[PDB]
Amino acid sequence: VLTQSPGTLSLSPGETAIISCRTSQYGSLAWYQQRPGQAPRLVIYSGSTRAAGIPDRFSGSRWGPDYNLTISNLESGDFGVYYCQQYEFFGQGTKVQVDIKRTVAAPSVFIFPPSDEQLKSGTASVVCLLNNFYPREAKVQWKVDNALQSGNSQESVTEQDSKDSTYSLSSTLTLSKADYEKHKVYACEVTHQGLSSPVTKSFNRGEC
Amino acid sequence: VWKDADTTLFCASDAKAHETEVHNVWATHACVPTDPNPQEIHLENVTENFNMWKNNMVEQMQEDVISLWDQSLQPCVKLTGGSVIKQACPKISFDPIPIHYCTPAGYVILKCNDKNFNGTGPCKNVSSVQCTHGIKPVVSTQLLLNGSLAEEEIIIRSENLTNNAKTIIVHLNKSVEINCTRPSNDIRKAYCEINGTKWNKVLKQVTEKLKEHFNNKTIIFQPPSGGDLEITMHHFNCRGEFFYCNTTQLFNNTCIGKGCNGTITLPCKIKQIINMWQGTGQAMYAPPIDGKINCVSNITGILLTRDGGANNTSNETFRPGGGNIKDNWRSELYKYKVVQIE
Amino acid sequence: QVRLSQSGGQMKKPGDSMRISCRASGYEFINCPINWIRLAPGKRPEWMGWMKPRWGAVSYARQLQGRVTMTRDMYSETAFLELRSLTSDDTAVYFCTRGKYCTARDYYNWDFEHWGQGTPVTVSSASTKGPSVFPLAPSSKSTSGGTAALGCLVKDYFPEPVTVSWNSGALTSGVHTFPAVLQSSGLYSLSSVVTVPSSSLGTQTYICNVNHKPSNTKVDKKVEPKSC
Numbered sequence A: 001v002l003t004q005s006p007g008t009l010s011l012s013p014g015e016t017a018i019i020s021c022r023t024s025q026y027g028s029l030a031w032y033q034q035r036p037g038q039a040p041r042l043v044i045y046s047g048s049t050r051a052a053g054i055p056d057r058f059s060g061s062r063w064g065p066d067y068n069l070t071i072s073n074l075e076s077g078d079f080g081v082y083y084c085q086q087y088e089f090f091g092q093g094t095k096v097q098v099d100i101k102r103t104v105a106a107p108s109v110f111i112f113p114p115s116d117e118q119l120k121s122g123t124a125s126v127v128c129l130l131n132n133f134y135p136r137e138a139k140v141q142w143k144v145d146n147a148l149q150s151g152n153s154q155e156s157v158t159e160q161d162s163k164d165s166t167y168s169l170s171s172t173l174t175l176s177k178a179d180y181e182k183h184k185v186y187a188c189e190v191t192h193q194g195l196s197s198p199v200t201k202s203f204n205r206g207e208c
Numbered sequence B: 001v002w003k004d005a006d007t008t009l010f011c012a013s014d015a016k017a018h019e020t021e022v023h024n025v026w027a028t029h030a031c032v033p034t035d036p037n038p039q040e041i042h043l044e045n046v047t048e049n050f051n052m053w054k055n056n057m058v059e060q061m062q063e064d065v066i067s068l069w070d071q072s073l074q075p076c077v078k079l080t081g082g083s084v085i086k087q088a089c090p091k092i093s094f095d096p097i098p099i100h101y102c103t104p105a106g107y108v109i110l111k112c113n114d115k116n117f118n119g120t121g122p123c124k125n126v127s128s129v130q131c132t133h134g135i136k137p138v139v140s141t142q143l144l145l146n147g148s149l150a151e152e153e154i155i156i157r158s159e160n161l162t163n164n165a166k167t168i169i170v171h172l173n174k175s176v177e178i179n180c181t182r183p184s185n186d187i188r189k190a191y192c193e194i195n196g197t198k199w200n201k202v203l204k205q206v207t208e209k210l211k212e213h214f215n216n217k218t219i220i221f222q223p224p225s226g227g228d229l230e231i232t233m234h235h236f237n238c239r240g241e242f243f244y245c246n247t248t249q250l251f252n253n254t255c256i257g258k259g260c261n262g263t264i265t266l267p268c269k270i271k272q273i274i275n276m277w278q279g280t281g282q283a284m285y286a287p288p289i290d291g292k293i294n295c296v297s298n299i300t301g302i303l304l305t306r307d308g309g310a311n312n313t314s315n316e317t318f319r320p321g322g323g324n325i326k327d328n329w330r331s332e333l334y335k336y337k338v339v340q341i342e
Numbered sequence C: 001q002v003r004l005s006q007s008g009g010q011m012k013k014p015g016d017s018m019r020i021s022c023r024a025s026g027y028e029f030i031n032c033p034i035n036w037i038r039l040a041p042g043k044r045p046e047w048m049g050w051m052k053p054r055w056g057a058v059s060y061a062r063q064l065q066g067r068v069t070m071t072r073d074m075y076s077e078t079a080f081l082e083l084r085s086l087t088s089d090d091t092a093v094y095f096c097t098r099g100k101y102c103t104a105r106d107y108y109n110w111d112f113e114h115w116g117q118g119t120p121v122t123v124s125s126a127s128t129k130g131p132s133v134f135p136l137a138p139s140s141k142s143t144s145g146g147t148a149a150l151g152c153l154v155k156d157y158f159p160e161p162v163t164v165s166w167n168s169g170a171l172t173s174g175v176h177t178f179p180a181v182l183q184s185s186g187l188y189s190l191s192s193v194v195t196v197p198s199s200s201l202g203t204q205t206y207i208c209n210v211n212h213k214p215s216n217t218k219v220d221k222k223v224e225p226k227s228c
């Protein structure tokens, strides 16, 4: 009923955050900010009305069912997670986090087949690594015998590196041993701005 | 020309000077006699907006009924805010009379006569009256008693149905009697009788109306989720005594979707220690009077709340509501609003 | 000035019940409903229900019907929350809230200007389970002109956290230990990786040292190229 997007914004101070929320029903929509380790705060209510204490850099707008919170000239105190709300219903949230700008860097992509030690257990984990890339935005898709995979994968991302300002991501495809021994080609496909084309790293089960 | 406005209304009634009954005594000093030949003017080509949920007439009637009760139903002991007030508490004659509210000079009451008018929005048939109809200041929860019926269909009323915090008033078009009795010779134990055939047919009609407002979802009734006894039970005053009746049987989902065709009897009890609806604390009264205590009332409305939450099921659940006695006056004052002439 | 103060955080086991309090001040307590909202990391905020102080009238969220009870004390102007049959999913920070607009005559419940400071609650088993550690092996041929990636997969442990060092902390450059993910089984897993020169694969020994204080587990694992 309330669909907030995007999940994450990675921005520098001074830039503008644009956070949207689509509702399936018109009514008074409110926006909340939750700073780290602090209680949520009313930012906007009734779509565009600013709560007391909220500077005019925050502004709410609406186009049809789409409500937007735009935060201009981002300051330190603006980062955190934002939520849209309608009655008792809330959006999934939008995490606005500090990003330090650097040149684009394509990820170094590696894939790791399941250990033979793990295959004795009955489960198979295939790991794909995306190393030292920028910007944060990246997509990883798993393919097993050229079939797109959904719901059997989990990702994890590092904090932006203090030194080289890059990110690194790890995706894990998880299959039963039986299911794993059914197929041959295991591949993960990485799309990222630094790549002129999506890059696929793959291995064929059984052969070294 | 006129405009919406708020002013100090006055009261009219047919209170008897010889009557020792409480509502009569109050209205004698607070109100004027009624007009034998009232004047109603139907307005053609006139469309007005109404809002029963923002009608300050309700506020003034509330003040009155509070004043009436404070100056009449004095407890033996009044427990409020940490202190104790021990007064005299003789038994009283208690039977609500009709009360008319009227506008002073320069003002007038607009009345909405759309037969299917739901409480808010525009009205086509607008008439101009000086006073409202006679409204009995019946204080109760869950069920509206002795009120006026809806002319045509059963009307659903809410400030906003999509807001689960807003009370729903169900306005019936056919009344169902509720016959409450404390027999002679446990003195505090009592009961209410309701015709199961008539009620369940009405209740079924109610769910059918509710379907029209909730996308043909399954309409389920449930007992109150919690709160004080005054709201988790059908609370009302009959002949001075404070009744608490259990309405679980009244909202039998089985009977609205065989065998419940019979007499519904609700378990009630007369409590001497009550929570004051005027909004203070607890009040203690004398034990009930001897002999048969009996009140037969018209159930003319129902107070409901609707369940909410981040669910996804295709059934809406409703529970008996009330507690905000202002809503009681809203249900009778819904078709009126005050306007000032120029 | 409107204030809502909540009781302190607590920890619970699955199956327990919990009660928390919210003391209100700075306004006429009976005029407005008090709400309970819980925030868990990576989940939508969840409205649990409201309570109107006048009669203690309550409205519980459908999915919590039966497990939750909201009460109030009029004198101490304190609202109370109770949640029974706790499980892992109940782990969250619990807030009481009240609407911005509240007069003696009217209110709007849902614009939550006023929040209590929050009451963190953790529900978890007292049981611990040490990690399984599997090597993430480099590659087949040693490309003497590039760098290789290796690491170890630290799977199925409970609870948090585990730490990973390489070669007893001697190897730090190029190391990436990822934040753990919570698996469907209710157990955690993470990976630690490091990039090294490919030319050093038949010379240098690489060992990941996994530490899991709750299960009192320290395990070293040697990550070497597969032989075929």
Ligand SMILES: *[C@@H]1O[C@H](CO)[C@@H](O)[C@H](O)[C@H]1NC(C)=O
Pocket: A027, A028, B120, B159, B160
């Ligand atoms: C219902 O609520 C919305 C906002 O939630 C408000 O704009 C609208 O005026 C309300 N409707 C009525 C009839 O009060």
Ligand SMILES: *[C@@H]1O[C@H](CO)[C@@H](O)[C@H](O)[C@H]1NC(C)=O
Pocket: B113, B114, B115, B116, B124, B125
């Ligand atoms: C208004 O009055 C006219 C004239 O009797 C009637 O036909 C019409 O049904 C009325 N409108 C409503 C909404 O009741």
Ligand SMILES: *[C@@H]1O[C@H](CO)[C@@H](O)[C@H](O)[C@H]1NC(C)=O
Pocket: B118, B119, B120, B121, B122, B156, B157, B158, B161, B213
């Ligand atoms: C009452 O009628 C108005 C005007 O048509 C409409 O906007 C509102 O939703 C209705 N309310 C109910 C409870 O049916």
Ligand SMILES: *[C@@H]1O[C@H](CO)[C@@H](O)[C@H](O)[C@H]1NC(C)=O
Pocket: B146, B147, B175, B298
């Ligand atoms: C109850 O309803 C009947 C008809 O339904 C009516 O004649 C009677 O006057 C009503 N009693 C009241 C309003 O007290």
Ligand SMILES: *[C@@H]1O[C@H](CO)[C@@H](O)[C@H](O)[C@H]1NC(C)=O
Pocket: B151, B152, B153, B154, B155, B173, B174, B205, B209
């Ligand atoms: C009351 O209204 C319902 C529709 O809500 C209708 O089916 C029924 O016939 C009405 N009863 C009357 C007018 O006596």
Ligand SMILES: *[C@@H]1O[C@H](CO)[C@@H](O)[C@H](O)[C@H]1NC(C)=O
Pocket: B179, B180, B181, B193, B296
């Ligand atoms: C109400 O019920 C009593 C028995 O409980 C019965 O004697 C009496 O006749 C009933 N009154 C009416 C008006 O039906």
Ligand SMILES: *[C@@H]1O[C@H](CO)[C@@H](O)[C@H](O)[C@H]1NC(C)=O
Pocket: B195, B196, B197, B198, B262, B263
């Ligand atoms: C209930 O009301 C019906 C009329 O709708 C009547 O025929 C029946 O006798 C009543 N039941 C009892 C037990 O009096």
Ligand SMILES: *[C@@H]1O[C@H](CO)[C@@H](O)[C@H](O)[C@H]1NC(C)=O
Pocket: B232, B233, B246, B247, B248
């Ligand atoms: C009402 O009566 C039913 C009958 O079993 C009982 O279960 C319920 O607890 C009662 N409710 C109250 C509020 O006393």
Ligand SMILES: *[C@@H]1O[C@H](CO)[C@@H](O)[C@H](O)[C@H]1NC(C)=O
Pocket: B248, B249, B252, B254, B255, B258, B259, B260
């Ligand atoms: C509803 O009616 C059925 C059949 O008469 C009965 O068994 C059941 O107890 C009723 N539910 C109540 C009284 O809550």
Ligand SMILES: *[C@@H]1O[C@H](CO)[C@@H](O)[C@H](O)[C@H]1NC(C)=O
Pocket: B095, B096, B138, B145, B146, B236, B237, B238, B239, B294, B295, B296, B297, B298
């Ligand atoms: C409803 O009105 C009748 C008289 O018409 C009276 O006997 C009965 O007690 C009233 N009910 C209440 C709850 O006041």
